[PDB]
């Protein structure tokens, strides 16, 4: 083999490693930002505070790496 040992690429399990590091959900992959430091995924609406949109910059860093 899989690409994720933690969820064995079971798309019907939550995974905070290859999906949203905060809630684990794989829904709205278009709204899951990839930290340009640790390469985790984050729902814009899981961040505290939530981002109403996908940032307009060239890089983004999650609350754990900033």
């Amino acid at each position: 083999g899989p690409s994720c040992k933690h969820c064995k690429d079971d798309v019907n399990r939550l995974c905070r490693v290859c999906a949203c590091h905060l809630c684990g959900g794989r829904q709205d992959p278009d709204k899951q930002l990839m930290c340009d430091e640790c390469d985790m995924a984050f729902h814009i609406y899981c961040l505290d505070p939530p981002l109403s949109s996908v940032p307009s910059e060239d890089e983004w860093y999650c609350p754990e790496c900033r």
Partner: peptide
């Protein structure tokens, strides 16, 4: 540009597509 999970997933799909074919 900020990368999304979707963008990353699409790139892996594209890479896979080329090997699915046979690399050309």
């Amino acid at each position: 540009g900020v990368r999304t999970l979707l963008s990353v997933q699409r790139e892996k799909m594209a890479r896979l597509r080329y090997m699915l074919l046979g690399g050309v």
